[PDB]
Each structure stands twice: as structure tokens, then as C-alpha cells.
Write a protein that binds this ligand. Structure first.
Ligand SMILES: *CC(C)C(=O)NC[C@@H](NC(=O)[C@H](Cc1nc2ccc(C(C)C)cc2s1)NC(=O)CC)C1CCCCC1
Length: 356
């Protein structure tokens, strides 16, 4: 198995497709770099466990994801060779250009790549410039403009320059924010610098929207992995490019489905690692940021919690408050006293009703 050509392909597709260490929901059960497990979560974990050779519980290491990737590369290579429209192109290409073709197969399947009849012809004929121009005219160039440009450059040059240069630009940028006492992460100072460079306050909602798009785990913490993967997925190689992405992130929250996802992420981001709940003071601080102009009883809710609850906020209570905020009438007349709401919200309605 180890005799086959080589593994710059793993990092190439880690940049283009991304690496997920936990079982993710695909448009179904997927892990690593696009590795399909089945078509029940118990069956997905069963397939993953048998493939890895341990009880993973849905979480794998980078090396474990690399092993699944190599199996997917080999499967793709076999498929390409069994395809009459792809094999003559594949056989004729060098190791680097073969990797760019496998990348296309990973993204749209063999049928989709086969559709580029005129472009494949130019590639087989070693007309690199003509193929680079023709592949840019395609719709594939608009779906993934960052990925497509990288793949086109790989076919045009026969080098890893597009991926090397992006990693170099991001690595130099990372050096400005990294902690002097720890290279693998961005400290308090670095986070402040990053926010300063974006001309935003670190406690602002815009920074919280960024954290949501970066899928950052904890507030006041920012790892090299989060920075590298976040910037690449957002198609940004500089602070200016990330700054220009903020209006689109804002517009996305005007859709309720995306707002629910962002609101629920805020709980996970705001909490202290090792704690299941969110401290009252921290919850109120984040509620005033995410529910500002969405919940009429927000201040009365805060006043109620500081005077009557004085305790931690669980995940379910956090999630359910968004549902309460959107259904509740201005006079609270539509509130169901025996309608599944947590005790805390029942007590809030009882406390708030005499104050109209
Ligand atoms: C001790 C400490 C850092 C602190 O003051 N924590 C509470 C306040 N939190 C913030 O100001 C955080 C700081 C940030 N953490 C990260 C982590 C990752 C990123 C990347 C770029 C995505 C960015 C930031 S900024 N800010 C936020 O959580 C955004 C609202 C603060 C006090 C009360 C108001 C909210 C929390």
C-alpha cells in the first residue's frame, strides 16, 4: 500500500475542504476531510469505531483522520482510472497536477469533473495557460472562488505555490498575534491586537459574530488551529479581507435559522471550560449583546435574575429564552402557566405581570 506516489494532498485538501475531528452534519454522517461513515448516529459511531480500531465516541485525532483520508484518496484514484473520460488525463499528468484533479473529484465527483471536456483536453495536451483560462470561465469558479483559484494555479504551474504562499501569508500574520510564552496559541494581548487591527472593541457584538464564524471554543482564548482554519474557510489572508466579510456575517443573522445557531453558540462560547452552566453575571452580559432589540422584557429579566435567581444558567434555559422572547405578547397575556416553559420563566412572568 505504501509504494504509491506522494502526501502534500492531505494538507492541500485540509485547506480546501477543511478538517473536522468530531462527527459533523453533512447536506450525512461525516468526519475528517469529507469522509462518509454511513446513511442512525449509532451506526455512524459503529462504522467509525471499526475503521479506527477503538471506542472513539465520535472524536478522532489528526493522524486518525489522515488514515481515513489516504483510504479516500486511493478509492478516488481507482474510480478515476475506471472512468474513460478521466483516465487518459490522469495518466498523462505529473504528481502535482494529479493531486489537483483528485481535489476536483473530492469536490464534485467524477461526473462533475467529466463535464470539463474542453478543459481536460487542454490539460491532457499540456496547454497549461489555455486550461487555466478555460477553467476560470466555469461556474465552479463562483461556488468556491478561493478553492478553484488554488486548484487552477496548481494546474497552471505544476507547483504547490498557491497552498505554500497562502500558508506563508497566514503564518506571518499569525506571528503578530501569538503569545511570546506560548507559540501554539494567541494570548490576551494578541486577541486585543487582532481586535485593534479590525478597529473593533473586543467586547462588541461584531467580535462575537466573528467568533461564531471561526467556531471558537472559549472567550479570551484563540488557538493557532482556530485562526488558521477560520481564516482559510472565510477566504481571508489579511485583516482587511476579514473586515470586508463582517457586513455579510451581519446580513446572515437577519435570517432566524442562522440567528438561532449564533444565539445557541454564544452560550458555549461564553461559558468557562469545565462548567456545564453559565454564571449569571456572564449570561446577563451576553444576553444584553445578543437579545438587544429582540426582547422587550430584557432589563426586567436581568433585574429579576439578579434579585430572585442569583444562580447559574443552564443550556436549555438559555436556548428557550429566544423562543419566549419571540412569542411573548407586550402584556404577557398569551403566556401558558402550564405550557412546558422552565420554572425560571414561569416565575419571571409571575414577577413581571404586576409591573405590566
Ligand atoms: C478575562 C477576560 C478576557 C474577559 O474580560 N472576559 C469577559 C469579556 N470577554 C471578552 O471581552 C471577549 C474577548 C475575546 N475573546 C475572543 C476569542 C476569540 C476571538 C477570535 C478572533 C474569534 C476573539 C475574541 S475577543 N469577547 C467576546 O466574547 C465577544 C463579545 C466580556 C465581559 C462582559 C461582556 C462580554 C464578555
Amino acid at each position: 500500500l505504501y509504494f504509491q506516489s506522494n502526501m502534500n494532498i492531505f494538507e492541500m485538501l485540509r485547506i480546501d475542504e477543511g478538517l473536522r475531528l468530531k462527527i459533523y452534519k453533512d447536506t450525512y454522517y461525516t468526519i475528517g476531510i469529507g469522509h462518509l461513515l454511513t446513511k442512525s448516529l449509532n451506526a455512524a459511531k459503529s462504522e467509525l469505531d471499526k475503521a479506527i480500531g477503538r471506542n472513539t465516541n465520535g472524536v478522532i485525532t489528526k493522524d486518525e483522520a489522515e488514515k481515513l483520508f489516504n483510504q479516500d484518496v486511493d478509492a478516488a484514484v481507482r474510480g478515476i482510472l475506471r472512468n474513460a473520460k478521466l483516465k487518459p488525463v490522469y495518466d498523462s499528468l505529473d504528481a502535482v497536477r494529479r493531486a489537483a484533479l483528485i481535489n476536483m473529484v473530492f469536490q464534485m465527483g467524477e461526473t462533475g469533473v467529466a463535464g470539463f471536456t474542453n478543459s481536460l483536453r487542454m490539460l491532457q495536451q499540456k496547454r497549461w495557460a489555455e486550461a487555466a483560462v478555460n477553467l476560470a470561465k466555469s461556474r465552479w469558479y463562483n461556488q468556491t472562488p478561493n478553492r478553484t483559484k488554488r486548484v487552477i494555479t496548481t494546474f497552471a504551474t505544476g507547483t504547490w505555490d498557491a497552498y505554500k504562499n497562502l500558508r506563508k501569508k497566514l503564518e506571518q500574520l499569525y506571528n503578530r498575534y501569538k503569545d511570546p510564552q506560548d507559540e501554539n496559541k494567541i494570548g490576551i494581548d494578541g486577541i486585543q491586537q487582532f481586535c485593534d487591527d479590525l478597529a473593533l472593541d473586543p467586547a462588541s457584538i461584531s467580535v462575537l459574530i466573528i467568533a461564531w464564524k471561526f467556531r471558537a471554543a472559549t472567550q479570551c482564548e484563540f488557538s493557532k488551529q482556530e485562526f488558521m482554519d477560520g481564516m482559510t474557510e472565510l477566504g481571508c489572508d489579511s485583516i482587511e479581507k476579514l473586515k470586508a466579510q463582517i457586513p455579510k456575517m451581519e446580513q446572515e443573522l437577519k435570517e432566524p435559522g442562522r440567528f438561532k445557531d449564533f444565539y445557541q453558540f454564544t452560550f458555549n462560547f461564553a461559558k468557562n471550560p469545565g462548567q456545564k452552566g453559565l454564571d449569571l453575571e456572564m449570561a446577563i452580559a451576553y444576553w444584553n449583546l445578543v437579545l438587544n432589540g429582540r426582547f422587550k422584557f430584557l432589563d426586567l429579566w436581568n433585574k429579576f435574575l439578579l434579585e430572585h435567581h442569583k444562580r447559574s444558567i443552564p443550556k436549555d434555559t438559555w436556548n428557550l429564552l429566544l423562543d419566549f422572547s419571540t412569542m411573548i405578547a407586550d402584556d404577557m397575556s398569551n403566556y401558558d402557566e402550564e405550557g412546558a416553559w422552565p420554572v425560571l420563566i414561569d416565575d419571571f412572568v409571575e414577577f413581571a405581570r404586576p409591573q405590566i
